[PDB]
Amino acid sequence: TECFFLQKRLQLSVQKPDQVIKEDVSELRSELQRKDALVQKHLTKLRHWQQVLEDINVQ
Amino acid sequence: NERLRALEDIEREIGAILQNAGTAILELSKEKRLLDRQAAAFTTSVQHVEAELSAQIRYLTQVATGQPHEGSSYSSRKDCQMALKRVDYARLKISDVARTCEQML
């Protein structure tokens, strides 16, 4: 079944690369969204830790 | 700790005893009530101040030979200074990373 799916993939790529281009664009968009979300989470955690250090360094 | 407050109270009591002796002498020499009791209280307070001064002077005399209690925990002071410096450097690096992230987004 896997080989049948891969043969279908070959025939589709040689018959219609626009679908492959659209899929690549969608994957790139999803990767960009995931990277932005991870960066936002890291920034939130870093700001929380910065406030924690500023409140704890009162000595 | 308590010896400092004791000496301060002894000095305040000596001052109060001097003031009470002066006031009692004034009231007794003004004209001729409570002058006798005032003079008695003044003499008693003066004797108490003298006894407290003598007791404080007759202290255990801890060292009287050299500089005592040498070493004021300088190692702990330096350790705390280094910890504060570490915290400051961590804060600076975190602020730099936050600025980089803000420039990214």
Curated annotation (Swiss-Prot), chain A:
Q: Which family does it belong to?
A: Belongs to the Mediator complex subunit 28 family.
Record keywords, A-Z: Actin-binding, Activator, Coiled coil, Cytoplasm, Membrane, Nucleus, Transcription, Transcription regulation
Q: Which GO terms describe its molecular function?
A: actin binding
Specify the superkingdom. Answer: Eukaryota
GO BP terms: negative regulation of smooth muscle cell differentiation; positive regulation of transcription elongation by RNA polymerase II; positive regulation of transcription initiation by RNA polymerase II; RNA polymerase II preinitiation complex assembly; somatic stem cell population maintenance
Q: Does the keyword Nucleus apply?
A: yes
Q: Partners and quaternary state?
A: Component of the Mediator complex, which is composed of MED1, MED4, MED6, MED7, MED8, MED9, MED10, MED11, MED12, MED13, MED13L, MED14, MED15, MED16, MED17, MED18, MED19, MED20, MED21, MED22, MED23, MED24, MED25, MED26, MED27, MED29, MED30, MED31, CCNC, CDK8 and CDC2L6/CDK11. The MED12, MED13, CCNC and CDK8 subunits form a distinct module termed the CDK8 module. Mediator containing the CDK8 module is less active than Mediator lacking this module in supporting transcriptional activation.
Q: Which parts of the chain are coiled coil?
A: 19-55
What's this protein's function? Answer: Component of the Mediator complex, a coactivator involved in the regulated transcription of nearly all RNA polymerase II-dependent genes. Mediator functions as a bridge to convey information from gene-specific regulatory proteins to the basal RNA polymerase II transcription machinery. Mediator is recruited to promoters by direct interactions with regulatory proteins and serves as a scaffold for the assembly of a functional preinitiation complex with RNA polymerase II and the general transcription factors.
Q: Which gene encodes it?
A: Med28
User: Protein name, please?
Assistant: Mediator of RNA polymerase II transcription subunit 28
Q: Where in the cell is it found?
A: Nucleus; Cytoplasm; Membrane
Q: What is its main location?
A: nucleus
Is S-adenosyl-L-methionine a UniProt keyword of this protein? Answer: no
One GO cellular-component annotation of the UniProt record comes to: nucleoplasm
Swiss-Prot record, chain B:
Gene Ontology BP annotations: positive regulation of transcription elongation by RNA polymerase II; positive regulation of transcription initiation by RNA polymerase II; protein ubiquitination; RNA polymerase II preinitiation complex assembly
Sorted alphabetically, the keyword list is: Acetylation, Activator, Nucleus, Transcription, Transcription regulation
Q: What is its main location?
A: nucleus
- InterPro entries membership: Mediator_Med11
Gene Ontology, cellular component aspect: core mediator complex; mediator complex; nucleoplasm; nucleus; ubiquitin ligase complex
Coiled coil region boundaries: none
Where it sits in the cell: the answer is:
Nucleus
* Annotated GO MF terms: transcription coregulator activity; ubiquitin protein ligase activity
The record's account of tissue expression is: Expressed in cochlea.
The record ties this protein, via Gene3D superfamilies, to: 1.10.287.3490
- UniProt subunit comment: Component of the Mediator complex, which is composed of MED1, MED4, MED6, MED7, MED8, MED9, MED10, MED11, MED12, MED13, MED13L, MED14, MED15, MED16, MED17, MED18, MED19, MED20, MED21, MED22, MED23, MED24, MED25, MED26, MED27, MED29, MED30, MED31, CCNC, CDK8 and CDC2L6/CDK11. The MED12, MED13, CCNC and CDK8 subunits form a distinct module termed the CDK8 module. Mediator containing the CDK8 module is less active than Mediator lacking this module in supporting transcriptional activation.
State the family named in the UniProt similarity comment for this chain: Belongs to the Mediator complex subunit 11 family.
General function of this protein = Component of the Mediator complex, a coactivator involved in the regulated transcription of nearly all RNA polymerase II-dependent genes. Mediator functions as a bridge to convey information from gene-specific regulatory proteins to the basal RNA polymerase II transcription machinery. Mediator is recruited to promoters by direct interactions with regulatory proteins and serves as a scaffold for the assembly of a functional pre-initiation complex with RNA polymerase II and the general transcription factors.
Name it: Mediator of RNA polymerase II transcription subunit 11
